[PDB]
Design an enzyme around this catalytic site. Structure first.
Site, PDB file in Angstrom:
ATOM      1  N   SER A  82      -1.669  -0.545  -6.054  1.00  0.00           N
ATOM      2  CA  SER A  82      -0.694  -0.264  -5.005  1.00  0.00           C
ATOM      3  C   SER A  82       0.673  -0.858  -5.296  1.00  0.00           C
ATOM      4  O   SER A  82       1.679  -0.356  -4.788  1.00  0.00           O
ATOM      5  CB  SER A  82      -1.145  -0.873  -3.681  1.00  0.00           C
ATOM      6  OG  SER A  82      -2.191  -0.158  -3.085  1.00  0.00           O
ATOM      7  N   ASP A 102       2.176   5.403   3.676  1.00  0.00           N
ATOM      8  CA  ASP A 102       1.454   4.134   3.692  1.00  0.00           C
ATOM      9  C   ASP A 102       1.240   3.680   5.137  1.00  0.00           C
ATOM     10  O   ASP A 102       1.080   4.523   6.027  1.00  0.00           O
ATOM     11  CB  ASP A 102       2.228   3.117   2.832  1.00  0.00           C
ATOM     12  CG  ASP A 102       1.336   2.072   2.212  1.00  0.00           C
ATOM     13  OD1 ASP A 102       1.126   2.124   0.981  1.00  0.00           O
ATOM     14  OD2 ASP A 102       0.846   1.197   2.939  1.00  0.00           O
ATOM     15  N   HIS A 160       1.302  -3.835   4.149  1.00  0.00           N
ATOM     16  CA  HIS A 160       1.130  -3.195   2.847  1.00  0.00           C
ATOM     17  C   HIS A 160       2.269  -2.223   2.556  1.00  0.00           C
ATOM     18  O   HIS A 160       2.854  -2.236   1.465  1.00  0.00           O
ATOM     19  CB  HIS A 160      -0.238  -2.509   2.844  1.00  0.00           C
ATOM     20  CG  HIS A 160      -0.634  -1.853   1.562  1.00  0.00           C
ATOM     21  ND1 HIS A 160      -0.365  -0.528   1.304  1.00  0.00           N
ATOM     22  CD2 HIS A 160      -1.381  -2.293   0.521  1.00  0.00           C
ATOM     23  CE1 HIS A 160      -0.889  -0.186   0.142  1.00  0.00           C
ATOM     24  NE2 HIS A 160      -1.502  -1.241  -0.360  1.00  0.00           N
ATOM     25  N   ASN A 175      -8.487   0.440  -7.634  1.00  0.00           N
ATOM     26  CA  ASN A 175      -8.800  -0.954  -7.939  1.00  0.00           C
ATOM     27  C   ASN A 175     -10.300  -1.212  -8.049  1.00  0.00           C
ATOM     28  O   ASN A 175     -10.815  -2.184  -7.488  1.00  0.00           O
ATOM     29  CB  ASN A 175      -8.247  -1.887  -6.864  1.00  0.00           C
ATOM     30  CG  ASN A 175      -6.783  -1.653  -6.556  1.00  0.00           C
ATOM     31  OD1 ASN A 175      -5.955  -1.430  -7.440  1.00  0.00           O
ATOM     32  ND2 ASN A 175      -6.455  -1.725  -5.278  1.00  0.00           N
TER      33      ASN A 175
END
Ligand SMILES: [Ca+2]
Length: 279
Positions: free
Chosen positions: A224, A39, A69, A161
């Site tokens: 996520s 990530d 994130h 998404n």
């Protein structure tokens, strides 16, 4: 063990019904497992990680999470308050820049890094990788995810998404990994969650409280956020001896809560991750 006033997603994955706020789990809590969070990085100094998080690789000028994130995702895996597997070891691999973006060649390199690097780490109960990222279909990206899984790492990947079929996104569309959709606290498919036959499981993904950079916390939404619930669950189950890296996605689907989500398009599984813990 019981953690009262937990984030709703933790409560949901130890429950047969929505609407409760206590997380129930075996005290072993993922001890002896390892989870790689691939990530934007992890703020390892955050008190919530208790010294159990380390950056092991970056492809950028720093290994710092300048975004948040990756720290949020790592917190759902394994932070003390906000995590599924509260005693797991967390390893950060920074394949995304501080804007949250990354080239596919760098993402591929990070996956092959984990397949090798697990041989440098002590993970007697098993190894998981959490990939809360994706983009358009790429056979090279899917192949890298398949290699990582083949190497003996449970790979959990976000479905995406776009409220679309996940067969058109990578690494979501790779059949051999565990592709995770998102649900909300009322057991509705999250409105942004991708769907389709390549999904394996759903997890909590709307309004998920976890760690953030600067020693903080916040609540955000996405597939996520669902993915690290499943990655942490896999680590937890592997520590208990209930499954292995090669079998964990199937085990999670076999033991899931079935038929409880709404607005599941026809042909997508109606399966919600569940730890089956009985105090
Ligand atoms: Ca699978």
């Amino acid at each position: 063990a019981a953690q009262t006033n937990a984030p709703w997603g933790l409560a949901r994955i130890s429950s047969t019904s929505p609407g409760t706020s206590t997380y129930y789990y075996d005290e072993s809590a993922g001890q002896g497992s390892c989870v790689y969070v691939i990530d934007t990085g992890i703020e390892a100094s955050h008190p919530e990680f208790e010294g159990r998080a380390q950056m092991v690789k970056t492809y950028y000028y720093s290994s710092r999470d300048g975004n948040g994130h990756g720290t949020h995702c790592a917190g759902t895996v394994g932070s003390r308050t906000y995590g599924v597997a509260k005693k797991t070891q967390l390893f950060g691999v920074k394949v995304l820049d501080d804007n949250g973006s990354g080239q596919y060649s760098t993402i591929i390199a990070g996956m092959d890094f984990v397949a090798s690097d697990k041989n440098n780490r002590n993970c007697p109960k098993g190894v998981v990788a959490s990939l809360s990222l994706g983009g358009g279909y790429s056979s090279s990206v899917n192949s890298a995810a398949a290699r990582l899984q083949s190497s003996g790492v449970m790979v959990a990947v976000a479905a995406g998404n776009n409220n679309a079929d996940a067969r058109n996104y990578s690494p979501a569309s790779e059949p051999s990994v565990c592709t995770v959709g998102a649900s909300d606290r009322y057991d509705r498919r999250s409105s942004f969650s991708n769907y389709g036959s390549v999904l394996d499981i759903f997890g909590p993904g709307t309004d998920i409280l976890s760690t953030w950079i600067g020693g903080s916390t916040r609540s955000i939404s996405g597939t996520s956020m669902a993915t690290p619930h499943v990655a942490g669950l896999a680590a937890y189950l592997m520590t208990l001896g209930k499954t292995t890296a090669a079998s964990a996605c199937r085990y999670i689907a076999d033991t899931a809560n079935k038929g409880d989500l709404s607005n599941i398009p026809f042909g997508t599984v109606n399966l919600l991750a569940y730890n089956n813990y009985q105090a």
